[PDB]
Each structure stands twice: as C-alpha cells, then as structure tokens.
Nucleic acid binder design. Structure first.
Ligand SMILES: [Mg+2]
Ligand SMILES: [Zn+2]
Lengths: 56, 82, 159, 208, 13, 116, 191
RNA sequence: CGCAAGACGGACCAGAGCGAAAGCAUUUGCCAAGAAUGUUUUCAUUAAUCAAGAACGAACCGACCGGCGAUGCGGCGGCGUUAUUCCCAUGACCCGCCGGGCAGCUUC
C-alpha cells in the first residue's frame, strides 16, 4: 500500500510542477493577432470565472 | 536645479508628469477590445470603466468597476486599440 | 448538626497553574476548578474558568503594533454557557523596513470577525469535555492565526 | 538601633522549591545601552544564583530563579532592577537597590493631565532652573531621582520614597513644588530641635 | 564603499 | 511530599500583615499583624515587628503539618503606591529562617487601569 | 480520544475526534462486550497479526468495529485533485497505524479508507477526513467554459458520513444524559 | 464568593488621523454627511473678497522658485518573497512614479 501511494504522489507532483513552469513561461508574452491572456499570476487581482462571483 | 528644456521635454519626462501638468493635456486611459470565453465575439471596453460590462451575445460578466482600472474576468483576452 | 460540613466545603474555587496539572505544559496558563461534591475525604472538582498570568499579558503588549480583541457568548452541547476572550498582535515581516506595522480599521474588523466564528463553531458543536481538551494546548489560537494570514499576519494569538 | 540580620546559604539549604519569573519591556533607544552592560548585569545577579536573559527579538528583560538560589525575596529585588534599566536609570545607580537598605518606586505621571502642553510645563517646573529643584529634592530626601518621559524613578530609604511620591504627584496637581521644598526645609530644622517634638508643627509650617 | 554603491507527508511537516 | 499553603503578606508603610490560608484561600489558618508584637505605633511597620509576626505564624504551621507555603506579596495599590513596605523583606526572610519551604512568589498588588 | 489528543510524530496534529456509531449514542440494541479470540479455533496467516475463520469450525463470533471520524490540522499543502486526496488519506492511515502500535502497543490494521484499532477488547474504526474534500467533489467545469459548484451524490454522501453523522451522534448522546430512559425506548423500537 | 451603584475607557497611542472652529478614543447595528483620489461623464462663467445680517462657539516680514528624506490616504507600473479565498474576501512585504494633506531640514 505504501509503495503505490508514494509512486502516485511522485507522478502527481511532477505533473503539477510542469504545469506551473509552463504557466510561468506563458505569463505575459502576447501572441499573434494581439491577444493577452488574463491570469491570476499577474499583480492586478482578477475576477474569477465562477458562478458565485458572477451572481455577486 | 537640473537644466530642462521647456520646449523639448525628454521621452521619460512627459509620460511621468501629471496629465494636467504636461505641455498639452493627454489622458492616460485607452479603449480595448475584449474577447470573452464561451463565444468569441469582440467587445470594446473602456479601461477605466465604472459599470459592469456584459457581453451582448451571451450576457457574461466581463469587467468589474474598481477605484482605478477595471478588473477583467479570468480567461478573457484583451488588446489595446488604435 | 443543623449545618453540614460539605455545604461549606462546596463552592470553593482553586487557582491551579497548568504546569501543576500537566506534566510538560506551559506555566503561564491557569485554570479555575470548583468543588461540586464531597465523597468521603475526597473533594471532586470541575472546570470553572481559564486565565493567563499577569506577566505574560504585560510582556506581549509592545508599542509599535496593533492589538485586536474579541469576545463571544456561546453555549455548549451539554448546556454550559461560556464567554471567551482572545488577543492578537500584528506581525512584522522579515524583509520589512518600515518601522510600524499597523492594520487598517476594516482589516481589524475582518480579523475580529474571523475571530468570532472560529470560537463560536468550535464550542457549540462540541461539549465541555472536548472544549477543555482544546484549551490545554490552545489549538483555538493556532487555528485563528492560520486563518488570518490572508488579511494581516499575526502572532501571539491566545485565548 | 537594630539592623536586619544577614542571610546566607547556611540559613537554609535548597530553600527555594519552585522557580518564579518576571519579564519587562524596554524601548529600542535603550536596546543599545542594555547590550553592552548585559555582561555586567549577569555577573551581578549570578552572585545570588538567579538567571537573566535579554531577548532582542521580543525586546524583553527576563529574570528567573534557579535551584541553587536560597533567598526567596531576591527575585523581587531582581524584578525591580530590570524595571529601572528600562526607565533609562544608569547601571551603577540601578544595581544599588539590590542591597537591602535601598528601595525603589516608579511613579507614573502621564495620566494626571489630559493636555500634553500643560503636562510638559509642570514637568519642567519639577526639574526647575538648572535642575536645582530636583537636586534640592534629592539632597533633602537623600534619594536618587530621575525624570524620564511620563515616569519618575526614585530609589532610597523607605521614608524618603514616601516624601518623593507626595511632591511629584503634587506638582501634577498644580501646586508649586517650591512650597513643598520649603516645607521640607522647615521640617528638617524642626527635627533638630528636641523641644516641642510632640507638639503640632502646623503653626511653624508656612501658610499661603 | 565602491562595491556598496554598485516522503509524501514530509511537505506537511 | 509537602503539604502546601497560601501565605498573604500585605506590607503597607503603616503596618505589615502576614496571613496564611489554604490553597483556595477561603479557610484561615493563622493571621498575625505587626501591632500585636510591638507596643508602639512607631514600630508597627518596622522590620523587627514583621519578623516576630512571621515567626509566630511559622511556628503555628508546623504542628498542623504545613511544610510549604506559596507567597502572595501585596502593597496598598489603587491610587497610592505600589511598593512593598519595609516589613515585607524581613517577614519573608523569617519564614525561610524558620525552616518553612517556599513555593512560588507572586505579586498581587491591585493595579488600577483607569486613573480616578 | 485522549490517546489521539497527544500523539506525536504526525505531520499534522489532530484537530477534532468525533464518534459516528450507534454504540456511542446509547442506541445499540445489543451492546458489545470485550472479546478474546481462541487460538485453536482459527488459523493464523503469520505474515500479519490477523486471524481467519476455519472451514470446519462454525461461524466465528461477530465483532462490529465502531466508526470514529478524525480531522487533522488545516493546511494548504493538500492536493487539489480528487483522486490525489485519496492517496494522501491512505498514507495518513498507514502512518497513524504505525505510530499507534509503536507508542502504546496496540494492534492496528491499516486500510485504504480506515484503520482498525483493538483496545481493551473493543475494536475501533478510525476514519481520517479532509475539510475541503466535499468542495473538491462539487467542482464541475461546464462545456460552455465556466466552472461552477453543484451537489453530487458522492459529495452528498461524504458530507453525511463525516459531518452530519457525528453531529447527530453527539446530540443524541447529550439527550440521554437528561433522560436515562431514552436508551431503552430507542433500542426496543428498533427491535 | 456573589450582587448593586457612580464615574472612567489605560497599556496599544504616534507631533499620526478627522472636523469650519470650539473639539473627537471599548464592541456592534442603524441614519444622514464629507475630504482626497480615479474619470476621453455632465452644465458652461454660474467666480473671489466682504461692512450689515445669520448659524455655531472651551471652562523680522511677504502666494518666497525649488530640493532632500520620512509620513497618511487614493491611483499607476514592477524582479521577487508570503498567504490564499463556498460564503466572507482578493491582501502582507519591497522598488519606482503621480496628486492633495500633517509636519521637519534646507535654500531662492
Ligand atoms: Mg500606498
Ligand atoms: Zn460572450
């Protein structure tokens, strides 16, 4: 039981680390046709895309 | 005091001064085109908006008024105009 | 005769430090025990109150920080009604250069509000036995400190 | 004339059973001076086998007894010492209260007057021109007095401290210190004359 | 002066 | 083991009181004041009077089995001074000189928070 | 509960211990008693301290473990994935069993959802729950492109087992204190 | 140990903040008011100073251009730390910049 738990968490943490590094690369950096993607990684707080925030 | 030419100010000087204290008044605001998720129709939104802007097609909340610049929703794509 | 020794024996309050009640716990926290029944040269007590020493309270209050206090009235599951007091102090960051660490009034009220529901929720759901077990290591104060980090960092949070 | 007997380790072996502690706070402008004199204060208190710790992060002065200590009251004299140091009292004056003959009193005068400018004016009246009135108080009382902020620290014989608290508080009550200083001078010379010792001194005391 | 002007549960611990 | 008691030492500039009670502080064991020892109003607060009062209280405790005392030092407090009297130091010394064991030392001088 | 309130070596400290069994609220029709298994009536694996019923002997005596819900100290290092939280909970089951048998010499069996502890002849089933887990199960990203929170049968089941059930057990436990005859009426009604 | 009454609101408390001045300090709910800041909104000279009159009212010198540091509020930009958002909430620290304030040190 302990081996499988450690194995799955090792794989899960590696996937999370890759996503964070990719997002850090992609923050800012406008692409072609002039589009900038609004993310939470910036310094200006952003409105979340949730049902509770929209109704509020 | 430092010697500055009133007729020909430096590039970093005019962008740093107050908008009313420049040689010619010029606002710091702008208009931008935003694209909401769910439908990719383009909407023109003022930067210092004072009212919540809703997409015409899908009625999605685009921006929320703040003290200064309006905060855009997550996942939206914006571009300065002109 | 016509008067009972246990009657005078009951209602006595003992002020005992937690260091005399626990083997390795701190000594600046004290508990109130009140005698309720007499069982043949054996006085039986129960929880009556909790308080901190005078010197511990005096040392925490510094000069260049903000103090936040809150109080609630909450009833336990077994019918005991309690009043709880908490104190908190704003914390200076390691890289901070500004001499003063003050929180604004709205930040104080948001901190004070979060103080109230945490004590309220952690008492009305449990009973007197469970509450005392929480009070011995002061897990209530640690929970408040963790929850208030988003508003303003805090230290020396205690019940 | 009876003097108090001395106390030593012979009088009780391992007299203390539980350890008592006291802590005090100091401002940062006193932090620098306390840093250099800490080797000295720990040496003085180690003679009585009571420990001291200077917390720089907390900004606190802490004294606590140990297992070797045999005199229970010395912790009170230890607590009084660290309070004086936080009130800018110098080291040599502060350590002298450890001797049994000397006492101490910290008088808080900030609460007396709501107006800050009125409080400062009367505080300057207590010090007087060239500090003469303070030392006129000092010589007559035979007590060391220092005024710092909203606190007045005085140390000496117990009869002296009672006189200091009266005059210092009276100054904040808007009655001139010169009246009290001159009153003490009359009291001293009356003590010289053995006659009429039982008789009242109200006539001899000055009247407004 | 010249320079001056110029394993899985371990994370929970 | 040691049988514990609570000793209250009120030390005014006028008089010194030494008072021993139980742990709860409700039952009185022995109370001797400075005036009961010396027959003069001058020396009620004298250190000599307090030492005599402490010895009489201390000798009272031994036949009752009391061996250890907790001490609560207290001054006049309130609007007046917060300084222990002259009798406080001598009385505390005499209790240890009598062989009585000493527990924790606490000051219980009433400190006002709002000035009148 | 006092043994848990004081256990050392855990990465996260225990924040709350709550019982969720009819025995702890005095509503069990036939109350259990401490039991001692007979060695010769069973056969032994010898790899784990667990016995198995024998083919020739009749059915063994019935033992029902009593469920206990335990909540740990709140932290932000927990995974934000539904199946990953299942992995961390299973690790906590193994760690709890390992420490309990080391500090107090109690027989513990670790399972992916619970830990079985034998103490004083009684068998307790300890469940470790995570506070924000029901909120994670309610996350439903819709096709149009907006993520919302909607109740789920799995999410509703988790809230009942870990939050609502301990509240009713403690509430009925207090009710028995005022009315000693509540236990007899409730048990007879079930029968 | 418990109860009742009259005041007062320490330490936190600063040359900080607010108000036309006199003045203003426990928690929470409610009512109306206000400064500054943000604005590619609106009207278009509607203004300044004032005897008379009205409301409130404790008990060296001069609009003398500037500069440097901190400080309170609002806004803008930013490499990095620190928490994190069902509700409640989107902050704490560091750096640069723009305003109106409370004050210092200097200059013309
Ligand atoms: Mg700012
Ligand atoms: Zn749309």
């Amino acid at each position: 039981l302990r081996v499988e738990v450690d194995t799955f968490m090792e794989a899960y943490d590696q996937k999370i680390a890759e996503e964070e590094a990719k997002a850090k690369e992609e923050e800012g950096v406008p692409d072609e046709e002039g589009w900038v993607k609004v993310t939470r990684r910036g310094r200006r707080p952003v409105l979340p895309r949730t049902e509770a925030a929209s109704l509020r | 005091p430092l010697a500055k030419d009133l007729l020909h100010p430096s590039p970093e000087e005019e962008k740093r001064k107050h908008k009313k204290k420049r040689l010619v008044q010029s606002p710091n605001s702008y208009f931008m085109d935003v694209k909401c998720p769910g439908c990719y129709k383009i909407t023109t939104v003022f930067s210092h908006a004072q009212t919540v802007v809703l997409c015409v097609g899908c009625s999605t909340v685009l921006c929320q008024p703040t003290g200064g610049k309006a905060r855009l929703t997550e996942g939206c794509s914006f571009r300065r105009k002109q | 005769g016509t008067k009972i020794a246990s009657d005078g024996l009951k209602g006595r309050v003992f002020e005992v430090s937690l260091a005399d009640l626990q083997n390795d716990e701190v000594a600046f926290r004290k508990f109130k025990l009140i005698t309720e029944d007499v069982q043949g040269k054996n006085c039986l007590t129960n929880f009556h109150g909790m308080d901190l020493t005078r010197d511990k309270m005096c040392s925490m209050v510094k000069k260049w920080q903000t103090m936040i206090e809150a109080h609630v009235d909450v009833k336990t599951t077994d019918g005991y009604l309690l009043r709880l007091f908490c104190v908190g102090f704003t914390k200076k960051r390691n890289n901070q250069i500004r001499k003063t660490s003050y929180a604004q009034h709205q930040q104080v009220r948001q901190i004070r509000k979060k103080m109230m529901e945490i004590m309220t929720r952690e008492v009305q759901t449990n009973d007197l036995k469970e509450v005392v077990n929480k009070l011995i290591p002061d897990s209530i104060g640690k929970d408040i400190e963790k929850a208030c980090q988003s508003i303003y960092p805090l230290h020396d949070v205690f019940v | 004339g009876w003097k108090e007997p001395a106390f030593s380790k012979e009088d009780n072996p391992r007299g203390l059973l539980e350890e008592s502690s006291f802590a005090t706070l100091f401002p940062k402008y006193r932090e620098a001076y306390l840093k250099e004199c800490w080797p000295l204060v720990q040496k003085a208190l180690n003679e009585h086998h009571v420990n001291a710790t200077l917390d720089l992060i907390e900004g606190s002065m802490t004294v606590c007894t140990t297992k070797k200590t045999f005199d229970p009251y010395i912790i009170i004299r230890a607590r009084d010492l660290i309070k004086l140091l936080a009130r800018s009292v110098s080291f040599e004056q502060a350590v002298r209260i450890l001797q049994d003959d000397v006492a101490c009193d910290i008088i808080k005068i900030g609460s007396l007057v709501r107006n800050k400018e009125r409080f400062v004016k009367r505080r300057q009246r207590l010090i007087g021109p060239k500090g003469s009135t303070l030392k006129a108080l000092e010589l007559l009382t035979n007590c060391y007095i220092m005024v710092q902020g909203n606190t007045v620290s005085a140390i000496g014989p117990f009869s002296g401290l009672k006189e200091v608290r009266k005059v210092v508080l009276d100054t904040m009550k808007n009655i001139h210190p010169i009246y009290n200083i001159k009153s003490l001078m009359i009291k001293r010379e009356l003590a010289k004359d053995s006659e009429l010792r039982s008789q009242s001194w109200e006539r001899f005391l000055p009247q407004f | 002066e010249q320079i001056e002007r110029l394993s899985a549960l371990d994370r929970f611990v | 083991e040691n049988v514990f008691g609570v000793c209250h030492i009120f030390a005014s500039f006028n008089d010194t009181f030494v008072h021993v009670t139980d742990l709860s502080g409700k039952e009185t064991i022995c109370r001797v004041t400075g005036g009961m020892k010396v027959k003069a109003d001058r020396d009620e607060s004298s250190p000599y009077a307090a030492m005599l009062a402490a010895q009489d209280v201390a000798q009272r405790c031994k036949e009752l089995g009391i061996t250890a005392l907790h001490i609560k030092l207290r001054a006049t407090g309130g609007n007046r001074t917060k300084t222990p009297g002259p009798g406080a130091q001598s009385a505390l010394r005499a209790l240890a000189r009598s062989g009585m064991k000493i527990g924790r030392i606490e000051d219980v001088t009433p400190i006002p928070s709002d000035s009148t | 509960s006092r043994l848990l309130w004081g256990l050392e070596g855990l990465p996260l400290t225990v924040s709350a211990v709550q019982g969720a069994h009819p025995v702890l609220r005095y509503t069990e029709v036939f109350p259990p008693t401490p039991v001692r298994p007979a060695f010769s009536f069973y056969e032994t694996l010898r790899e784990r301290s667990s016995l198995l019923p024998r083919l020739d002997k009749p059915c063994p005596a019935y033992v029902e473990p009593m469920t206990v819900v335990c909540h740990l100290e709140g932290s932000g290092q927990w995974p934000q994935d539904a199946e990953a939280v299942q992995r961390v909970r299973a690790a906590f089951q193994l760690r709890l069993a390992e420490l309990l048998t080391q500090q107090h010499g109690l027989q513990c069996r670790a399972t992916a959802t619970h830990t079985d502890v034998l103490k004083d002849g009684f068998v307790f089933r300890i469940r470790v729950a995570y506070q924000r887990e029901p909120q994670i199960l309610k996350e439903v990203q819709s096709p149009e492109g907006m993520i919302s929170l909607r109740d789920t049968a799995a999410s509703l089941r988790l809230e009942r087992d870990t939050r609502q059930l301990p509240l009713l057990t403690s509430a009925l436990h207090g009710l028995q204190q005022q009315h000693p005859a509540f236990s007899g009426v409730a048990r007879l009604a079930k029968r």
